[PDB]
Amino acid sequence: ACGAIASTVPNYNNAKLPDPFTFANGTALRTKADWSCRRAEISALIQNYEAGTLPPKPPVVTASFSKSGNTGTLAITAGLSNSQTIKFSPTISYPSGTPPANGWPLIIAYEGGSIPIPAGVATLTYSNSDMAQQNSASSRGQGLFYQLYGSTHSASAMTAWVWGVSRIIDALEMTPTAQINTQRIGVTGCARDGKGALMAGAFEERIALTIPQESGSGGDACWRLSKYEIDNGNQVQDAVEIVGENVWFSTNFNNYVQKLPTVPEDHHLLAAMVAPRAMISFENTDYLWLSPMSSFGCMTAAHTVWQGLGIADSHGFAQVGGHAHCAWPSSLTPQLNAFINRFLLDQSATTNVFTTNNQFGKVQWNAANWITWTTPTLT
Ligand SMILES: O[C@@H]1[C@@H](O)[C@H](O[C@@H]2CO[C@@H](O)[C@H](O)[C@H]2O)OC[C@H]1O
Ligand SMILES: *[C@@H]1O[C@H](CO)[C@@H](O)[C@H](O)[C@H]1NC(C)=O
């Protein structure tokens, strides 16, 4: 129904941010339904240029569940048609007592996350580093995911992490005795795990609420804006450095980090893949490594997609200073809880959150230099 999905745009060359509202073939988006097809195209482009191949659900996915006290263990097996299998067993921390009729809402927290989780929400601890190692460039192709698909599989570590989240949600769908409301699943992570959580929410449509925390470069920052920051003297993480530091991106991305204008996506399109579902990301201006201006401009550009879909308040951004990396400032708890309350707890909470302190160091944000499109009202 979307036709043949384009996965490359060989002639692309755009120093500003790619236009969310124009397909690779030059067709303009017009309807809300068009966004589903555009999202599928962005997925293919992101896989091709920076994330590697995200495998589909494998033929074998088995799950069993057991509970001791308030801790559940979800034992998952995943297997291919060639008989290869891997296994992993995330745990779930439950609120006590009788659950809601449809089960507990749940946040999948990469290695526990760094946000406070309200008392009526269960927490699943996902050991993403075991699914795909992330110590340094030395970690390439190591982790459970690669014991299934092969150490030379093109998936980045973050794409392998997404795959694991998808198997977790498969297992939850198969395991009603885990007492989870599978329509009310969120995801969160901080720092490198916040890069991971954004990827999970973008690519796995069953996630109702995505919460990336101080994800920086390769998260809710854009590659093109971070290149501008580093060229003008801010000591930011950028595309060139990040592919040498770790294995969060595919080896193919190495071919583009010096040629960012030729990449027909940026992370504003990655973030927009969450639409029309909900996301709020949190940033910290104390660390220029995180590329503060790039995150504000990137999420401002991503925001236009929700605006065009008539659901601006489903996308939040809050950027402040004055606290340590991955420490949670109580000043932002109301904004976090507004999104959890609305999108996971079914409350009538307002979620209009889009704020920065503009503390961007040696650069400023100038929307007209980066965002070239007007926002259409998709019909
Ligand atoms: O050593 C790296 C190579 O492994 C990488 O190879 C790319 C992998 O994905 C394919 O789609 C590309 O065609 C191929 O070039 O190139 C970069 C290099 O650093
Ligand atoms: C352009 O590409 C999109 C996405 O694949 C597709 O939905 C649309 O039909 C294409 N346009 C034409 C004229 O085929």
Pick the ligand that lies closest to the CA of residue 53. Answer: 1
- Is there an atom of ligand 1 within 6 Å of 258 CB? no
Token couple for 170? 């498969």
Contact between 349 and 341 under an 8 Å Cβ cutoff? The reply is yes
Residue 200 φ/ψ, nearest 5 degrees: -60, -50
Burial classification of residue 366, based on how many CB atoms lie within 10 Å of its CB (0-12 exposed, 13-18 middle, 19 or more buried): exposed
- Nominal resolution (angstroms): 1.7
- Is there an atom of ligand 1 within 6 Å of 53 CB? no
Token couple for 372? 């070239």
For domain 1-379, give its CATH number from 3.40.50.150, 3.40.50.620, 3.40.50.1820, 3.50.50.60: 3.40.50.1820
- Is there an atom of ligand 2 within 6 Å of 37 CB? yes
Which residue, among 113, 70, 64, 63, has the nearest Cα to 93 in the 3D structure? Answer: 70
Torsion, Cα 277 282 287 292, to 10 degrees, reads 60
Domain borders along the chain are 1-379
Q: Which amino acid is at 314?
A: S
3-class DSSP state of 29: coil
Q: How far apart are CA 275 and CA 77, in angstroms?
A: 30
Residue 16 CA from chain centroid, whole number: 22
Residue 375 φ/ψ, nearest 5 degrees: -95, 115
Contact between 208 and 278 under an 8 Å Cβ cutoff? The reply is yes
48-51: long-range pairs with CB below 8 Å, 24+? 48/7, 48/8, 48/252, 49/252, 49/253, 49/256, 49/263, 49/264, 49/265, 50/156, 50/249, 50/250, 50/252, 50/253, 50/256, 50/263, 50/265, 51/155, 51/156, 51/158, 51/159, 51/199, 51/249, 51/250
DSSP assignment, residue 25? T
- Is there an atom of ligand 1 within 6 Å of 188 CB? no
Q: Write down the experimental method used for this entry.
A: X-ray
Q: How far apart are CA 111 and CA 130, in angstroms?
A: 10
